[PDB]
Design a protein around this ligand. Structure first.
Ligand SMILES: [Ca+2]
Ligand SMILES: [Ca+2]
Ligand SMILES: [Ca+2]
Ligand SMILES: [Ca+2]
Ligand SMILES: [Zn+2]
Lengths: 154, 155, 148
DNA sequence: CTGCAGGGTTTTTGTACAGCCAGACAGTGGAGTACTACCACTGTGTAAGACAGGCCAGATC
DNA sequence: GATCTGGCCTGTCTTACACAGTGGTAGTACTCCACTGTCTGGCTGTACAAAAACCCTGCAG
DNA sequence: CTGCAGGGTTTTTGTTCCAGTCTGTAGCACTGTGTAAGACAGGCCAGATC
DNA sequence: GATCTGGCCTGTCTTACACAGTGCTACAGACTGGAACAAAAACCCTGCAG
């Protein structure tokens, strides 16, 4: 939430560590470990029926966006840089994030919990716009750090 | 007690009223000429001092001997401009390091090819010996070249 | 030590104070005058004899370097931007900062502490250099003059 | 009024009975762990001046 | 029209100037798990003596 | 036996006054950055022309 | 049938304007006390009530 570094975090960490007698912040690696569940690709799940032409592998995290674009020069170039998830894995991550509030709302709605297993309709908005010719530092020889497009949902 | 030491060459010579920089007078300390500095190399005395540079500049201005351009240039041993910031008689550590580094860089680019065997090489062969030196520094020692060699690349 | 912004710091502080606070970091406003010990222009001092050509006010902090250049565009233009200190104030700040270390060293050598309050000699190194290709946000250059 | 010493009170200071639980010291085997140091990585030329070569143009007889 | 010469151009050699900072990875030197039984030293109900600095008092000047 | 209307009781939670006294945050000046609206260029096809 | 021209429409500059951040600061709005108060929360306690 504060855009701090990895290094700088550890710096001020060792600082407060030797400062007043306690391990007030956790160091890096334990923060990394604790976080790795908050990313996509941690919760196991299923689909009924099974997915259409989708690998049932779940625990995967970040994929490379080219989707196995055969890099051979003869064909259309395959240099296009891209990153994404498995859409569905991102969805299950987002949903299990919100599960706390869904459980709160079920508490308010007083619906019995042995009756809240099937009838859920999540409405999902999605969006896709491009941010053009972005400015970024230390380019004296162009490396296409300009035209980006961000796929998103809510 | 103050010491003005941490100035690069260009600034030192510029603020102590020298001819910046690679002119016939080179040393900020010993007033021997350039070519003479190749005949003798080790035996020299350090003389250059602030107040005496002010004396030599007053001589340059008044011209009390009515000498010509070059004779006056020599009589003051090359002091044209009036210095104003006093500076300690010493060299820098860093960029002497970088200068020796780039000097050995050049001589390595030279000896990769032939120099005692080639009286006057051309630009193409110079860049080619550079290129094979860079490939050698990459295959062995894992050193790609940079635009200009800084302190780490010098070490 | 880690280049954080004001808003940066306030967010961090407010956060860590919300949870398990028991406020820990200090608010911004308090630092905004707590630093005044470490800046120039805080510590009393003088010179014997008094310095030549120097206004003897010992509390001025950051000063524009132009030194009251008459803005008259008739004359040579006063456009070049600069900021600096008064050397003396800088030196007294740095020295009275070293106060800790010099008293420590005085005690380590077991030399007396009440007397010997008059023969201290300080060798100070100065160093200046320009700075090339400063991406500007006047050309792209700048010169910094420091001392140690 | 001066300076000082028996007594005075009042307060601390400490030792005195007695019992009691908090806090550490050794025991081990390592497993972890924090910490510091590693990698990979952008990019592959410029700007100022001094000097000797060569010429060449502006003026001459 | 032959000759000459200062000034200009090309090529030269030398001193500067950006390249930090950020994340992932790894070896490695430094530190608590459970199990322990034991000891010291603070705590505590009053009574007992010992210092300290003043305030009055009394004798002395 | 049961039902609430509603008595007692402390507790809580306001709460009225001024002062503060800190604080966050919304100013404020600023200039650097990214964009999209709009001018306008031109070329170029259709319409008018020879 | 070969050629000149208005309209137009796609592409291109520009450029005005918004946002963005960052240190100063100004303020408005939170917190402190006594009295004193109303007024329910929840137990309990009676009472007209079946
Ligand atoms: Ca868009
Ligand atoms: Ca847009
Ligand atoms: Ca430098
Ligand atoms: Ca530099
Ligand atoms: Zn010399």
């Amino acid at each position: 939430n504060t855009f701090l570094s990895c290094s700088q975090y550890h710096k001020m960490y060792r600082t407060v560590k030797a400062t007043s007698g306690r391990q007030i912040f956790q160091p890096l690696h334990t923060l990394r470990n604790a976080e790795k569940e908050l990313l996509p690709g941690f919760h196991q799940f299923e689909w009924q029926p099974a997915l259409k032409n989708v690998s049932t592998s779940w625990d995967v995290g970040i994929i490379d966006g080219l989707s196995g674009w055969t890099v051979s020069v003869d064909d259309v170039p395959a240099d296009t840089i891209s990153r994404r998830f498995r859409y569905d894995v991102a969805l299950v991550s987002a949903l299990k994030d919100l599960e706390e509030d869904i459980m709160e709302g079920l508490r308010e709605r007083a619906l019995d919990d042995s009756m809240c297993t099937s009838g859920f309709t999540v409405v999902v908005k999605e969006s896709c716009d491009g941010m053009g010719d972005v400015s970024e530092k230390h380019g004296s020889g162009p490396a296409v750090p300009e035209k980006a497009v961000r796929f998103s949902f809510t | 007690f103050f010491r003005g030491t941490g100035y690069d060459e260009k600034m030192v010579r510029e603020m102590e009223g020298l001819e910046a920089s690679g002119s016939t007078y080179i040393c900020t300390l010993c007033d021997s000429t350039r070519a003479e500095a190749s005949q003798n190399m080790v035996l020299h005395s350090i003389t250059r001092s602030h107040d005496e540079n002010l004396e030599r500049y007053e001589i340059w201005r008044k011209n009390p001997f009515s000498e010509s351009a070059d004779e006056l240039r020599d009589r003051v041993k090359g002091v044209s401009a009036k210095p104003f910031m006093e500076t300690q008689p010493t060299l820098d550590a860093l960029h002497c390091d970088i200068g020796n580094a780039t000097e050995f860089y050049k001589i390595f680019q030279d000896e990769i090819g032939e120099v005692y065997q080639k009286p006057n090489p051309s630009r193409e062969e110079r860049r080619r010996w550079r290129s094979t030196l860079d490939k050698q520094l990459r295959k062995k020692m894992k050193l790609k070249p940079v635009m200009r060699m800084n302190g780490n690349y010098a070490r």
